[PDB]
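Record format v2
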Amino acid sequence: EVQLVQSGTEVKKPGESLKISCKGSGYGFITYWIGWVRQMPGKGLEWMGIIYPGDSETRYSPSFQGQVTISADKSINTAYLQWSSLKASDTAIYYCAGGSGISTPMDVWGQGTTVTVSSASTKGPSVFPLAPKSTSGGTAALGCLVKDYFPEPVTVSWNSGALTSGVHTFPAVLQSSGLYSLSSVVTVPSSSLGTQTYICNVNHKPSNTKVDKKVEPKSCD
Amino acid sequence: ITNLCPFGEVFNATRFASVYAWNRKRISNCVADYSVLYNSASFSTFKCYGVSPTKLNDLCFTNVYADSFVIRGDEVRQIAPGQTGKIADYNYKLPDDFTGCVIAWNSNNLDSKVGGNYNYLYRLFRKSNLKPFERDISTEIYQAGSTPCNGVEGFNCYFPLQSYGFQPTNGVGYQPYRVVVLSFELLHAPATVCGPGSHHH
Amino acid sequence: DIVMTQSPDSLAVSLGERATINCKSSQSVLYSSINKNYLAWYQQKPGQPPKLLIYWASTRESGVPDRFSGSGSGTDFTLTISSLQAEDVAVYYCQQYYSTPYTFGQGTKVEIKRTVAAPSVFIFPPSDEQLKSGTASVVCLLNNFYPREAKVQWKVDNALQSGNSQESVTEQDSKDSTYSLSSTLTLSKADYEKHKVYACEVTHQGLSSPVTKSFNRGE
Ligand SMILES: *[C@@H]1O[C@H](CO)[C@@H](O[C@@H]2O[C@H](CO)[C@@H](O)[C@H](O)[C@H]2NC(C)=O)[C@H](O)[C@H]1NC(C)=O
């Protein structure tokens, strides 16, 4: 069938120029007018632009015109993104979609690519535990916290993925210092305290940092 | 019954009319196989206005109209539901509410002769802009100045048509292109044209 | 440019039952030349690229379930569902594509009207190794509480600090059909040493009493 792929996902600092691509393939690819849409962190789909392979673009929606970034090299089935002096708010996820005609529905979409422009440098995460022993009854739950990691969030695993149920990993939370921090918790029985080992494996491939840490509460000397 | 209206007669057939006299063939009482067209890689421009790509084969219409003509490559943009210029305002006006599609592909190997082929023509002058689906074939001579034109050819009063200079050596914007317009008459009337996957099939 | 606006912002419906969304257009755009409606709806699972569900509000798409249908009259367009299901849940949006600009929709969230429940509320004092970092961050979480509304405050020596804390809410999980929140409070090493007892005051619709999970430093 007709499919689309995207690339160019990256961390950048503001005022810098980046190019992304939506490369597509299909039996009939000439039909499919390609449009671009932005999903910011906050809910909302914007439909920033529209173009067609060959011919010309259709008019960009009025608000986005000024940072317009459309297409090139139409023979090779790629729709480049060409813009400069990006705003700090431009960080979001962005999809491409297609339909047959000028006023027709978006049939096929791409994977999407996210980009970040938060102006700070790559930093290695800091991993901390969370343990109860005063209130340690009624199937109390334990987990790990990760703080001061800027570039991009990557998955934690629980004993190399041994346990999966009841685990609730939380989305990244940005702090005033421009970085991120999240927390991953799993519920365990109030008796299975020392019966098992509990280790969070945090991976952060942008920083290439892989850290394993065990968690259990400490009694006083 | 096969009941397939012939795409070849509109595309694979040889003789094409000039743009000022775009050929129209009416289409009814058959089944249209759009899949045969949107899989060929020979077309260089293929645009649509109102139709879906995936449900293209599963639609039913009252009637269809197939227009065919020949224009050069850089006038392909000029056909559109809303557009202006030489060809748009004086030879072929697509309505703003256009229902249908446009196909177009290169015909330099066919409609170009050594030293140029000038058999294809286009109207260059007219006093009022053409109405949608209006084909004017008047040989009346166009008045450009304030002096009353008259007679059978006039000073500053030029013949209303012009040939295309179709040489294989000209720019690709000038290399000839065979163009087909597909209009879809949809009325509260007996729907005679359907696709292979509609509810009647 | 024409404005598309959705009628329901949030929506909580138990499965196997009808749910309806409606969008308003500034100028009705349908059958300007041709019989169909030519506006559509899209659904996008969280963390997923959006897909389409019906062409022109009257044309089901390949691979679309038979219980999905759309009816749109004039400027109003009602999307109805026969039976809500677990895979049906996503953010919902409108499309207008008869004019050259599109504005889409506000966004219609979906829930499950089930397992009206109470949070499993825990508190977590800062880790010891974070004192080397000079920063004092303390966490108070809520596990398996369905009614998404989770008003939480903090109290150090029963002094209210609502400005300092952050909250992180998970999606409604497919497992228990419930949410989970993490409130991450941020402070400093010096200020943390001046106070004694740190707590977490959470009040939920599923709680007949406001509940507090406290701790005293140094135990
Ligand atoms: C005539 O029209 C057909 C319709 O697509 C063109 O395409 C061929 O279609 C036949 C079946 O009808 C297939 O077997 C071939 O594989 C198709 N060939 C190509 C190149 O698409 C066909 O090319 C047209 N021929 C001419 C001379 O115009």
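The pocket of ligand 1 is lined by residues B 8, 12, 36, 40 (CB under 6 Å).
Residues 86-90 of chain B form the longest helix (5 residues).
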